[PDB]
């Protein structure tokens, strides 16, 4: 009955994209001229941190990042002078994530505790605790200096107002445990890859879902948009980074290789959108072009498995974090 | 005898530099337990750099062609550096037995700001018994072959008296050995008890390391440093009876020892493939 | 802008005092797991001795509780977290064998948690408990463990063993059930982790020595395994 | 939770959708324009480099 026409939707999708797909990314890229090899060295080494970093987020003004550790400190860098700033000590040692505000006055952590805390800078102390979540979260975003976005493994998701505490909407959908998500540059919308191998696209003001992706077969650990905003990129624990794109209602290009069979913790993208850089189990880090599909550098150099990246605004440096409680500036 | 002699030289020197060198270029190995490591791979590089060469030529030229102040700076730099490479095996071993025997207190009890302390003091010990007795003219022999070295510029070969030779012998071996005895046997005690303990519980299911680790670590050291030190009491409590030549050999043996620290403390899968990085 | 970097400086080194401060503290306390398989009276057992903390200090050593019921999942990703701390109690009731089974379902989650590839160097403390009444339920002929477990039928009672006045079936019933695990724990393991099974009932008094040998035993064979005298 | 299932699936089957020929051109003209402004790309003076 009902789930007879399932079957029969499902194919009418598939067969509508599989005639939109005349020519592949890489054949229209065969005439543009290698990147070439690309080598980088670092440039600071951030130190203080008693266990492992689990989360890490660059500021607006491309100065100033916060990290979050399990030993239960919130401490907030000066990469180009190496000074610590804060040192936030949390009520719960399990933590997750951890965001900062685009105004940089507020800064968000979380984890296996199910409660979201913000933190006021200048004035330290909890400004607001939010509740309602049934599992831990994993992964929060700043929308404006009053509403916030939050992933939980109760696979759902909900946009908060800060001021009453309040779930405004709640986005629901996905079966397994939600583990990252990410927003647009307009702020939009925004897209977000659980456990059962699929990711998808919200509108933030309807909180209805748009589009579904199925491409992997593994649990989804990261995701981040395409700099012009029409495409994003995605990684699982099966070795394998895949592009996909908004408009055309498929996935484009794979990123793997033979030499390797570890998972992927972190995937960001370049100031131009040309690079992917992709963090591994490995112990180390690779780099990607984007429009080619081929390896032109690896960052080496972290004792434990990288389990934080990214690139700041300006992109004029990259921030990895691993489990060796160190922090690290490539440039 | 160039030969052999040149390869002693090279050995103790390559083998040193690379457990200083991988230590200080890699974070991961730098624990306090590898300080003590670092400090005695120090002392013998001095000692391979210093004392071999000279010595070397002073038995093949058979003449010392250097004067009279540099023949006792060679004699104080020599026993500067043998009793502080004896003294950082006890010290060692005091690790070992305070991390095996007492589990929970062992992070609070060290620390590194212990640790240099520790080596400082070691080091403060070892000078104090080198260059003190010897610069200030305190161990030298008082009789008719020992005063006809000392006056000749080209001869200036070991006289002693016996009150040196015995305190310096037991400060640099004596002490350091029933200490490490100790706290071996109660190692070695510790580890066969926890050993039973498995059996009584899952043995169906299914001490020989343990006494060739120790064996080979009390084995390599006693047979290096036991003869000469016997000989140094000997030759001075009975006269005319320990010829010059066993007594060079014994040092010489003693000297060897040098060589075969970084393989004994320095096979952790972590140096393995810290050197295979380099 | 000369005065900006001084000041800056400053709090940089009021900062750094108090982070080796609380450094002596995180070292010397040890961080413990507790899991659950579902009834087998875990909280009863800890109240006598989001996710749930509790502290407790025997002979001047801090230990430091974990217990997670906010997380009711089949699978378990939060499981990665716990890759440091010092052991994992298990707690299982050895007397739901016949109840729908529930001690097959408990063997098959100790074999998950096991073979883990992230905690493949931490031990489990393992508590039976429910003794009692399984006891009782084994002399009352209602029930028999053949009709649920057919390897019972082969199974004789091991000669290096120590019963408590006590019946030998229910002796047998015991390290039967104890073996089951037993044959898991010895099937994977490498020397890197061992397993401490123990019997447990609700009038137990001593569950904290036990834990406290439990945790002695662990460091100790690590630093003897560390110095290659084990 | 039959109904919810199908009611979602025939939202989005409706939608338009764009030829991969035009999607992969428009990626490739945005790299190639914005490519000048990238430090990553191209290793930039230590003049200019704040971290050198
Ligand atoms: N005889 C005996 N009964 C027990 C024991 N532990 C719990 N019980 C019984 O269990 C009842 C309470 O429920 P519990 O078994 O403690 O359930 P719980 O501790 O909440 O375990 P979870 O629900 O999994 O968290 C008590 O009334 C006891 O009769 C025990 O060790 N021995
Ligand atoms: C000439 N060689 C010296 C002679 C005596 C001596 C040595 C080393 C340590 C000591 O405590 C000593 O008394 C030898 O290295």
Not at chain 2, 92 to 118: C, G, W
Not at chain 2, 146 to 161: V, W
Not at chain 2, 224 to 241: E, G, S, T, Y
Request: aromatic share 10%.
């Amino acid at each position: 009955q009902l789930r007879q026409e399932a079957e029969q939707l499902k194919n009418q999708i598939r067969d509508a994209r599989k005639a939109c797909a005349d020519a592949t990314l890489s054949q229209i890229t065969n005439n543009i001229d290698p990147v070439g090899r690309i080598q980088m060295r670092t440039r600071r080494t951030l130190r203080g941190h008693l266990a492992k970093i689990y989360a890490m987020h660059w500021g607006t003004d491309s100065r100033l990042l916060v990290s979050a550790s399990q030993d239960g400190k919130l401490i907030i860098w000066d990469s180009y002078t190496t000074n610590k700033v804060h040192a936030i000590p949390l009520r719960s040692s399990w933590v997750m994530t951890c965001a900062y505000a685009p105004s940089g006055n507020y800064v968000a952590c979380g984890g296996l505790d199910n409660i979201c805390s913000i933190y006021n800078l200048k004035t330290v102390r909890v400004s607001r605790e939010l509740a309602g979540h049934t599992g831990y979260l994993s992964c929060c975003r700043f929308l404006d200096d009053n509403q916030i976005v939050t992933s939980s493994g109760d696979t759902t998701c909900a946009l908060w107002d800060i001021e009453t505490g309040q779930q405004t909407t709640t986005f629901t959908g996905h079966t397994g445990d939600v583990m990252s998500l990410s927003l647009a540059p307009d702020t939009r919308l925004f897209v977000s890859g659980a456990c059962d191998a699929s990711a998808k696209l919200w509108d933030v003001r309807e909180g209805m879902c748009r589009q579904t992706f199925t491409g992997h077969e593994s649990d989804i650990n990261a995701i981040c948009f395409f700099p012009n905003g029409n495409a994003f990129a995605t990684g699982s624990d099966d070795a394998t980074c895949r592009l996909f794109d908004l408009r055309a209602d498929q996935e484009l290009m794979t990123y793997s290789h033979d030499n390797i069979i570890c998972g992927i913790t972190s995937v960001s993208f370049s100031k131009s959108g040309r690079l992917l850089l992709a963090g591994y189990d490995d112990f180390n880090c690779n780099v990607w072009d984007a429009l080619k599909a081929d390896r032109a550098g690896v960052l080496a150099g972290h004792d434990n498995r990288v389990s934080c990246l990214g690139v700041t605004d300006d992109g004029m440096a990259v921030a990895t974090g691993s489990w060796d409680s160190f922090l690290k500036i490539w440039n | 005898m160039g030969i052999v002699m040149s390869l002693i030289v090279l050995a103790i020197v390559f083998g040193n530099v690379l457990v200083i060198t991988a230590i200080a270029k890699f974070e991961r190995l730098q624990t306090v337990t590898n300080y003590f490591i670092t400090s005695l791979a120090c002392a013998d590089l001095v000692m391979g750099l210093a004392v071999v060469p000279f010595g070397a030529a002073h038995i093949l030229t058979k003449t010392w062609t250097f004067g009279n102040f540099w023949c006792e700076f060679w004699t104080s730099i020599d026993v500067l550096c043998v009793t502080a490479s004896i003294e950082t095996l006890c010290v060692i071993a005091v690790d070992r037995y305070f991390a095996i025997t007492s589990p929970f207190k062992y992070q609070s009890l060290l620390t590194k700001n212990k640790a240099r302390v520790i080596i400082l003091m070691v080091w403060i010990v070892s000078g104090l018994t080198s260059f003190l007795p010897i610069q200030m003219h305190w161990y030298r022999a008082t009789h008719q072959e020992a005063i006809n070295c000392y006056a000749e510029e080209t001869c200036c070969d070991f006289f002693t008296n016996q009150a040196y030779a015995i305190a310096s012998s037991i400060v640099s071996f004596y002490v350091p050995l029933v200490i490490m005895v100790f706290v071996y046997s109660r190692v070695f005690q510790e580890a066969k008890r926890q050993l039973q303990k498995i059996d009584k519980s899952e043995g169906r299911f299914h001490e020989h390391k343990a006494l060739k680790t120790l064996g080979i670590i009390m084995g390599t050291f006693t047979l290096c440093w036991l003869p000469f030190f016997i000989v140094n009491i000997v030759h001075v409590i009975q006269d005319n009876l320990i010829r010059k030549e066993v007594y060079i050999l014994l040092n010489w043996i003693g000297y060897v020892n040098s060589g075969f620290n970084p393989l004994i403390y320095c096979r952790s899968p972590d140096f393995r493939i810290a050197f295979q990085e380099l | 802008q000369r005065n900006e970097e001084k000041a800056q400086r400053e709090a940089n080194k009021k900062i750094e005092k108090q982070l080796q401060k609380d450094k002596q503290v995180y070292r010397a306390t040890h961080r413990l797991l507790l899991l659950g398989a579902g009834e087998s009276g875990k909280s009863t057992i800890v109240k006598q001795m989001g996710i749930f903390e509790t502290k407790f200090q025997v002979d001047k050593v801090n230990f430091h509780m974990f217990d997670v019921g906010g997380q009711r999942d089949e699978r378990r990703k939060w499981i990665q977290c716990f890759n440091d701390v010092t052991a994992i109690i298990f707690v299982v009731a050895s007397s739901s064998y016949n109840m729908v089974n529930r001690l097959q379902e408990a063997l098959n989650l100790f074999k998950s948690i096991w073979n883990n590839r992230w905690l493949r160097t931490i031990s489990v403390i393992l508590f039976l408990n429910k003794q009692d009444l399984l006891a009782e339920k084994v002399l009352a002929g209602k029930s028999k463990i053949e009709d649920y477990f057919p390897e019972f039928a082969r199974y004789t009672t091991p000669e290096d063993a120590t019963p408590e006045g006590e019946d030998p079936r229910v002796t047998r019933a015991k390290y039967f059930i104890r073996d089951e695990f037993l044959r898991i724990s010895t099937a994977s393991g490498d020397g890197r982790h061992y397993c401490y099974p123990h019997f447990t009932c609700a009038v137990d008094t001593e569950n904290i020595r036990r834990v406290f040998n439990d945790c002695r035993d662990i460091i100790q064979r690590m630093h003897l395994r560390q110095y290659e005298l084990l | 939770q039959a109904r919810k299932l199908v009611e979602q699936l025939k939202m989005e089957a409706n939608i338009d959708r764009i030829k991969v020929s035009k999607a992969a051109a428009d990626l490739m003209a945005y790299c190639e324009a914005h490519a000048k402004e990238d430090p990553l790309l191209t290793p930039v003076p230590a003049s200019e480099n704040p971290f050198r």
